[PDB]
Design a protein around this ligand. Structure first.
Ligand SMILES: CC(=O)N[C@@H]1[C@@H](O)[C@H](O[C@@H]2O[C@H](CO)[C@@H](O)[C@H](O)[C@H]2NC(C)=O)[C@@H](CO)O[C@H]1O
Ligand SMILES: CC(=O)N[C@@H]1[C@@H](O)[C@H](O[C@@H]2O[C@H](CO)[C@@H](O)[C@H](O)[C@H]2NC(C)=O)[C@@H](CO)O[C@H]1O
Lengths: 858, 858
C-alpha cells in the first residue's frame, strides 16, 4: 500500500563498482549470457534510517544501460521489462529491510561500467495501486548523492587497457606540448581557417561601430548579422566603419565557385565582402565577427582573404528523442552553428523512447509518444526510460514550434534535415499507433484503427533490439498501413517546411540497427556453446519480422528476397514516398541500405549515408565502397565525432563510450575525414592502442562531415550543451577547412600507429596549438555571451620545487587553485607560480568569470 | 580600284568590348550626343597578313544597332548613311594598313552592347566602281570568327546591375529547385493543361493504330490530324483503337460555350471527342496526341476531360521584314502552333528593311522592297541592313505562296492576321513607291507615277526613327495617294485571303513608334543642355511631317488638330478603308491609337491593341485604360513574351534585350497576363531588381496573349526556330490555361517584389516543374520530329567531392560531359555521377540524339 511505497522511498541507495572485469576474475560471465563473456560486479546498498520495512507487496524500478545477469543476495531478484527498465523484487526469503540497516544487493551486469554516468538516477517504488514514488536520494543529477567514487583501476575495460586515466598529474602531461600565445601571434585568425588569407599590420578599429550594407541579404538573415555585431559589443551606426557587401558568382572560379564562398577585404577605414551567394556574404560577415576580440577593444586585423567550404554538408546531429531538448536550446545550437559556418542540422525527432514532432491527423504520436510515465498498458505514455522518474516526462515541438525552428535555421544559412528513424528505433511510433488502433477499434471504427497501424497482428517474432526492446521497436516494413503511416508523416513535415520557407531537400530514413542482437557473434547457443561467448537459447530467436505472415507472403510473391533484405527494401520503398512528395534526396545510417545494389536502387537521384563504422574496425576501408556505389558519404565516425562520448578518460565524465574512450577538442580537430587511413598515425583505438589502416580501393571523396549528439545521458539542456561545446568548434573547423597536414588519400599507403611517419605531425600540432589558443583567449568568451553551458576543461597541474605549475587544454582560460579543500579559491599566475604544501585543488573559470570546471585534487 | 577592294577584303576583323560603361568611367557620353549620357568603348582591330594597303580611295561599310559617336584613331572616321549602316573611311592622316600589321580603331558607341550578337557580321569594302567585297573572316554566322569573348563584368549594363550571369555554376543554382519526375508522375498530362481532367489507372494502348472518325472535320483539317498520328508513330487503321468525334454546341455551357471547347473521353478500348465546333474537335484530337509518349510505347492514360480556351486569341507574331523567313519555316511554325492550340498568326509582312508580299499592280514593292543590295540610288534595292552582305539579300512570298500559307493555317484552325505597318516602319514601301514614281515619271506617265506615291514632294521634315532611318521611314498620312496605296494593298491581300478560304477578320495597321527619337527625354539641346542627357542640336529637329505642306493644309482646314495627332488620324482613316473592304476588326500597336478618344473613333466595330509597354514601367496600370476605352487588349509585354530576347543572361546568347535581359521557358510560363500587378512577386526587372505594381482602376479583362519573334538578328531560319522554340510551348500553355496561382485581379492590391507574399509561389513552382519535365521527357522529342531547330539549354553543373552533378532547365533531357576539352563526350548519369578533375565541359543532347546545346566549361 501507500505506506509501504512511502517507506521504500526513504531508503537511501548507494551504488559501488566492485569489479569491472569480473570475467577476468572467476565469474563465468558466459554461463550468464554475457556478450563475449564479459561481465561486471556492482554493489547496490539500500540503507534504512527508519523503522523496519517488512511488507512484501512491492516492486522497485530502476534503469541501467546494462542488463542484470545475476543477483547475489537470495532475498532479492531482478528482471527486465524492456529497454533500460528493470524491476527489483523480494523473493520468498526476503525478511525485510531492518530498522537502521544497510541491505547489500550485489549483482552481475553485462559488459563493464567504466564511467559513473553509467549509473542512472531516479529509482522508484510501487506497491498495490499506491502511487509510485522515487527513492529520494536518487532524485538528482548529482551522481555523488548515490554513486560511490571509482577507485584503483576500476576505469580499465580489460587488464591490458592502455588508455590513460586523466588526473591533474597525467592531464598536465597531456597538455604540456601546449602553451599560451601572445595576443600578437593571434592577429587576423579567422575561425574556421579560411582557404587563403594575408594579414597586414594595421588594424581596423570598430569600437565606434560599423555601418553595415546588408542589402545583399534577405531581412531575417541580415538581422542575424546585425544582432551578432551587438552581442559582441560593436555598435551598428550609419557613421561607423563601412562594411560593404555584394554578390557576384562570376568573381569565383573553380573550387571557389560554390555556395558559401566569399572574398573578403578588411582595410583601415572600410570593409568589403563579395560572396558567391547570400550564404557566402553571410559567411564573410561571420569571418569578420570571428575576429572581434573578447576584450571589447573592437580592434581586428586588416587582411585580404579568399574562402570556400571544403564540403557542402557540414552538419550537427541532435537526438531529442531519448531525452527532450527545448526550443530555446535548439535555437542556441543554431546560433552557434551559424557563427562557425556549419550549414546542416540533422534533427533526430523520434526513436524508441520518444516522438517529438506534432503531426496533424496523428495525435497519438505526441499524446502518447511524447511522454514517458509509469503506465504498464502504455495507453497514455511510453514506459519510463533513462532515469527521469516515474511521473510524466517528455515534451514535443508543436507544428508552430517546428516551423519557427526551420525559419530560424534558414536565417542562419542552416538546412534542417528531419529524421524519422525506421524500421528499427521506432518503438515510440509503434506503441503510439497501437494506442491509436485500440482507441479507434473500441469505437468500432475498424478501418480508421488499421489505417496507420505499424504492427502485424500475427507477428510473434522474438527479436531483441540493441537497447534491449523487443519486436515493438520494429515498425513492420511489409504492411500497406506502415507505408500509409510514413507517407502521412512525410506529407505533414514537408508542409511545415514549405510554410517555413525551406522546403525539405533531404529526408532522413534512419535505418540503423534493424537486427536481432541475440543472433550476434558474441552470443552462442545453449545446445552447443562455444567458448568466450554469452550462452543463451537461440532456438526461439528470430530475425525481425520472421513471424509476420504479411512479411511471408511478401517474400513469397517475390517482392523481397528474404527476411534479411527487409530493411533495404524498406529504405527503397521510403525513397519512392520521399520522391512522390517532391524531395530528391534521401539519407540513412549506412547499415539500413547495405543490401541495396547501389544508389541506382533508390527513387531519389541522390542518396546520402551517415557512415558510422569505427576506423580501427576496417572503417577506413569499408567507407570506400559507399562512395564507389554512388552514395554521398557524410563521414560520422563514432570514434571521433560522436559528442555523446567523453571529453577525457575519467570516471567522473559524462558520456557513452562504445566506439572509443574519449574525444576531446584536440582529437576531433585532428581527425582527417577525407583520408581515413591517416588517422592511424594520429590517434589510438578504444583501448588506447596503436592501430594500422590502409585501403587499396578508389576513393572519390567524402561529401561532408557530421558530429552527433545522441542523448541517452544528456537528460537536461545544460548537459546537452556541455557535451556539444566547445568541441563542436573543432568539428566546424574540420568540416570547413582542409589542413596542410591532411594528406591526399593514397591507395595502398599503410599508416601504422607508432611506426610510420607519413603525417606532418609537427604541422598538425602547430595548427592545434593556435586553434586551442583562439578558443581559450577569444571564442569561449563568445560562448559565454550566447548562454551555452559549455564544458570548462579541468586544469592539469603538478608541484615542482613546492610550487604549482598549471596548464589547460585551451590556453588563455583562467586557472584557479585552492589550498583549503576548495573553500577559498585564488587566481593562478604562470609567471609568479604559488608555493603550496598538502592538498591543492585546481579548477578553470570561464572568461566572464561566472562558471567553473569541476574541481580536482592535484 | 578592284585591287584595293580585293586587298581590303583580306583584312581580318576582330571586335572586342573595352568598356560597356564608359560614361561611368571618364567618357563624356553626353557631350557626344549619347541618349541618357550612356556610351561604350569598343575596339575594332584590322589585321593585314598581306602587303601594305596604302591606297586612299576606299570606303568600308559595316552594320551596328548602335550609333558610332567617336573614333579614337585619327587615321579614320565613321559616318552614318541610314538605319544600321555605317561607313568607315580614311582621313587625310591615313598612312595605310601596314604589311603584317594589326590596325586598332577604338570607337565610342551609344548605349551598351551586352551580348556578342550585338556585333554584326559581313563588313564589306568598296572603291571607285570596283564591285563590293566582304572582309572574308566576317562572312559568317559564327561570331567567334571576329568577335572576342566578353570578360569580367562586361555583361553588366550599369555598375549596380543585379542580373545574374549564367555559367554552369550559377545556372546549376538557377535550375536546382527542379528535378526529374518518374514516368509514373507524368500520366495523363495534356499540354496545354486542360480545364478539368480526371485520369484513371489504365492506359489505352494505341501501338496497333487508331481508327479515326474524322467526319466532323473538313478534309484538309482531318488530314492534319491523320498525318500527326503518323508523325508520332501511331498507325491509322480501320481495325485500330476507335476514336470517335461529334460536334454538339449545346453540350457546352457557360465559359465552355466557345470555339475550341471540347469534352474528351479516353477509355480502355475506345476514344470520344465532342467539340463545340470543328476547332474543339481538332483540339480534342490534339490533346490525345499530346499524350502520345516519346518512347513509341503508344500507351496513353484513360481519363475524362472538359476543356476550353481562356482566351479567343492565342497568337504568335513573326517578323519576316527585317530578315526573310521561307515558306517552309512558316509552315513548320504553324504545325507547332496547331499542336499546342495557338490559333492566331500575326504576320509582319513589311517594315523599313523589307516588303515580303507580292501585290498585283504594285510590282516595285517586291522588286525593290523585297531585296536589299549595295545600291546608293535605291533604284533596284533597299540599302543593305542587318549584316547580310552587300550583294542582293531578300525574298518575298508570291501571291500563290501566301495563299498556300493561309490555306495551311486554316487547316490547322489558325487565323492569319496580316500586318502592313504604318505610318512609321514603312521605309520599304516609301522607297519602293519612290522608285515607282521615278520610273513612271520618266515615261511621262505623271498621273500613274503619283497614284500610289507615299512622299510629299515639299516635305523637308528632319526626323529620326527608332532604328535611325529618317523621314523616308514615314509614309505621309496626309496624301490622297497614301490612302490610294493602303486601299490597293488591303484590296489585294483581302482577295488572296478570299481565294484561300479564310477571308480576313482582322487587319493589322501597325502604328508603332511614329515619332522623332531626337525629341525624346534622354536627349537635350545644345543651347541649354541639361545634365546626364545626350547633347544634340534640336533647333532643326521636327516632329514627323511637320514640314509637309499637305499635312499643313490638312491641319488648317481642320481635318486634324495638330502634327502630333497625325498617327491616330491615320489609324482612324485606315479603319474606314478596312471596313470599306468588308473587314470589321482592326488591330494596332497601342501607341499609334493613343490619341483617339476611344474605340468609338474607329470604323470597325472592333479594335484590338497589341499592348507592348513593359510592367516595371507602369504597364500593369496603363493597360487598364486600353480595355476601359473599348479596346480589345492583346497582351504582348516585351518583358515576357518578346522571343527576340535572350533565353538567359550570357554574352554568347542571341537576342535583342531592350525590354528585359532574359525570358526563358520558365519566365514565360510564370507570366500572368490577366492580373499584371502580380508579376511583381514572380519576376525581376531589366536590371534584375525587384519592382512593385498596383492599379486602382477597373480591369474587365484581356482579350488574348501574343508572343513576338522580331527578326533583327534572326538572320536564318534555324536562328528563328531557336528563338521561338521551345519557349513558345510556354506561351501556348499560358494563352490556353488560367493556372490556380494566377490570382484574380484586385484593384488596390500592391504586389511588392521580395516583400509581399500574395502569390501561391509553391503552386507556381510545382506547376512549372511538371511542365518543364513534360518538355524534357516528351514534347521536345516531338519537336525533333517536326524538324524545328529549337534551342537546347546548356546544363548547369557543379563539382562536389570531385564528382560531377548536372541539371537542366527541362528535366528529362540527356546531358553529356567531356574531360578532354570537348574532344570526347560521354553520357552523364545522375545516379552514378562521374569523377572529374581539371576542366570539364557539359552540353545537353536532343532526345533523338542528333543535336547538342552549346558546350560550356564547368
Ligand atoms: C550502452 C551502449 O553503449 N550501447 C551502444 C549503443 O548506444 C550504440 O548505438 C548507436 O549509438 C548511439 C549512442 O552512441 C545510439 O544512441 C544510437 O541509437 C545508435 N545508432 C547510431 C547510428 O549511432 C550501439 C552501436 O553498435 O552499440 C551499443 O553497444
Ligand atoms: C537596338 C534596340 O534594342 N532597339 C530597340 C528597338 O528594337 C525597339 O523596337 C520595338 O522592338 C522590336 C525589337 O525587340 C522592334 O523590332 C520593333 O520594330 C519595335 N516595335 C515593337 C512594337 O516592338 C524599341 C522600342 O522602344 O527600343 C529600341 O530601343
Amino acid at each position: 500500500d501507500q505506506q509501504l511505497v512511502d517507506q521504500l522511498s526513504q531508503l537511501k541507495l548507494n551504488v559501488k563498482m566492485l569489479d569491472n572485469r569480473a570475467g577476468e576474475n572467476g565469474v563465468d560471465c558466459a554461463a550468464l549470457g554475457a556478450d563475449w563473456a564479459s561481465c561486471n560486479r556492482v554493489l547496490f546498498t539500500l540503507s534504512n534510517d527508519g523503522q523496519a520495512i517488512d511488507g512484501k507487496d512491492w516492486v522497485i524500478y530502476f534503469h541501467s544501460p546494462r542488463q542484470t545477469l545475476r543477483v547475489d543476495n537470495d532475498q532479492f531478484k531482478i528482471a527486465h521489462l524492456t529497454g533500460d527498465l528493470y524491476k527489483l523484487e523480494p523473493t520468498a526469503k526476503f525478511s525485510g529491510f531492518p530498522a537502521g540497516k544497510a541491505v547489500e544487493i550485489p549483482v552481475v551486469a553485462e559488459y563493464w561500467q567504466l564511467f559513473r554516468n553509467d549509473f542512472l538516477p531516479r529509482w522508484y517504488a510501487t506497491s498495490g495501486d499506491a502511487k509510485p514514488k522515487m527513492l529520494a536520494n536518487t532524485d538528482t543529477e548529482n551522481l555523488d548523492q548515490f554513486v560511490a567514487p571509482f577507485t584503483g583501476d576500476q576505469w580499465k575495460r580489460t587488464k591490458d587497457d592502455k588508455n590513460i586515466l586523466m588526473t591533474p598529474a597525467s592531464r598536465f602531461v597531456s597538455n604540456a606540448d601546449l602553451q599560451t600565445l601572445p595576443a600578437g601571434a593571434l592577429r587576423g585568425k579567422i575561425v574556421p581557417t579560411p582557404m587563403q588569407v594575408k594579414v597586414h599590420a594595421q588594424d581596423a578599429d570598430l569600437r565606434k561601430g560599423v555601418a553595415l550594407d546588408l542589402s545583399t541579404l534577405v531581412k531575417p538573415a541580415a538581422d542575424v548579422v546585425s544582432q551578432r555585431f551587438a552581442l559582441l559589443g560593436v555598435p551598428v551606426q550609419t557613421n561607423g566603419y563601412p562594411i560593404k557587401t555584394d554578390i557576384q558568382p562570376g568573381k569565383f572560379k573553380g573550387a571557389m565557385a560554390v555556395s558559401g564562398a566569399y572574398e573578403l577585404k578588411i582595410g583601415k577605414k572600410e570593409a568589403q565582402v563579395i560572396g558567391f551567394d547570400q550564404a557566402g556574404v553571410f559567411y564573410g560577415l561571420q569571418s569578420i565577427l570571428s575576429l572581434v576580440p573578447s576584450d571589447g577593444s573592437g580592434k581586428i586585423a586588416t587582411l585580404d582573404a579568399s574562402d570556400a567550404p571544403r564540403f557542402p554538408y557540414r552538419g550537427i546531429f541532435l537526438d531529442v528523442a531519448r531525452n527532450f531538448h527545448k526550443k530555446d536550446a535548439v535555437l542556441r545550437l543554431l546560433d552557434q552553428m551559424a557563427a562557425y559556418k556549419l550549414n546542416k542540422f540533422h534533427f533526430h525527432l523520434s526513436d524508441d523512447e520518444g516522438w517529438r514532432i506534432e503531426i496533424p491527423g496523428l495525435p497519438e504520436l505526441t499524446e502518447v509518444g511524447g511522454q514517458r510515465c509509469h503506465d504498464l498498458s502504455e495507453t497514455t505514455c511510453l514506459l519510463p526510460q533513462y532515469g527521469q522518474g516515474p511521473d510524466v516526462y517528455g515534451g514535443f515541438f508543436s507544428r508552430q514550434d517546428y516551423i519557427d525552428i526551420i525559419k530560424y535555421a534558414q536565417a542562419r544559412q542552416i538546412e534542417v534535415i528531419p529524421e524519422i528513424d525506421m524500421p528499427a528505433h521506432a518503438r515510440a511510433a509503434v506503441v503510439s499507433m497501437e494506442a491509436r488502433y485500440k482507441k479507434l477499434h473500441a469505437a468500432g471504427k475498424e478501418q480508421e484503427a488499421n489505417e496507420f497501424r505499424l504492427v502485424d497482428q500475427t507477428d510473434t517474432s522474438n527479436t531483441t533490439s540493441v537497447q534491449f526492446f523487443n519486436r515493438q521497436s520494429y515498425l513492420n516494413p511489409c504492411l500497406d498501413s506502415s507505408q500509409r503511416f510514413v507517407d502521412k508523416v512525410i506529407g505533414e513535415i514537408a508542409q511545415m517546411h514549405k510554410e517555413a520557407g525551406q522546403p525539405i531537400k533531404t529526408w532522413h530514413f534512419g535505418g540503423d540497427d534493424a537486427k536481432n542482437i541475440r543472433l550476434g557473434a558474441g552470443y552462442t547457443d545453449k545446445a552447443k556453446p562455444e567458448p568466450g561467448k554469452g550462452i543463451i537459447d537461440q532456438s526461439n530467436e528470430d530475425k525481425p519480422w520472421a513471424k509476420s505472415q504479411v512479411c511471408q507472403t511478401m517474400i513469397k510473391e517475390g517482392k523481397v528476397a528474404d527476411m534479411e533484405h527487409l530493411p533495404s527494401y524498406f529504405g527503397q520503398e521510403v525513397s519512392k514516398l520521399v520522391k512522390a512528395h517532391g524531395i530528391d534526396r534521401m539519407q540513412a545510417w549506412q547499415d539500413g541500405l547495405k543490401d541495396a545494389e547501389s544508389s541506382k536502387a533508390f527513387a531519389t537521384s541522390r542518396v546520402g549515408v551517415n557512415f558510422w563504422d569505427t576506423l580501427y574496425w576496417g572503417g577506413f576501408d569499408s567507407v570506400n565502397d559507399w562512395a564507389n556505389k554512388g552514395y554521398e558519404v557524410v563521414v560520422s565516425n563514432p570514434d571521433y565525432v560522436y559528442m555523446d562520448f567523453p571529453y577525457e578518460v575519467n570516471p567522473d565524465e559524462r558520456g557513452y563510450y562504445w566506439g572509443t574512450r574519449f574525444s576531446d577538442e584536440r582529437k576531433v580537430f585532428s581527425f582527417a575525414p577525407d583520408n581515413m587511413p591517416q588517422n592511424a598515425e594520429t590517434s589510438v583505438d578504444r583501448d588506447g592502442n596503436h592501430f594500422n589502416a590502409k585501403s587499396d580501393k578508389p576513393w572519390p571523396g567524402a561529401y561532408g562531415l557530421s558530429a552527433q549528439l545522441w542523448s541517452e545521458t544528456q537528460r537536461t539542456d545544460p548537459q546537452m550543451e556541455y557535451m556539444i561545446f566547445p568541441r563542436a568548434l573543432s568539428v566546424a573547423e574540420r568540416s570547413w577547412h582542409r589542413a596542410g597536414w591532411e594528406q591526399d588519400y593514397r591507395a595502398g599507403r599503410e599508416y601504422k600507429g607508432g611506426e610510420t611517419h607519413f603525417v606532418d605531425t609537427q604541422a598538425l600540432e602547430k595548427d592545434w596549438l593556435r586553434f586551442a589558443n583562439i578558443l581559450g583567449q577569444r571564442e569561449l568568451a563568445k560562448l559565454d555571451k550566447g548562454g551555452v553551458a559549455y564544458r570548462l576543461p579541468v586544469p592539469g597541474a603538478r608541484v615542482a620545487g613546492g610550487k604549482l605549475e598549471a596548464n589547460i587544454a585551451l590556453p588563455g582560460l583562467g586557472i584557479e587553485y585552492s589550498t583549503d579543500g576548495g573553500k577559498q579559491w585564488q587566481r593562478y599566475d604562470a609567471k609568479a607560480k604559488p608555493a603550496v604544501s598538502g592538498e591543492v585543488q585546481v579548477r578553470s573559470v570561464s572568461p566572464d568569470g561566472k562558471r567553473y570546471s569541476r574541481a580536482e585534487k592535484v
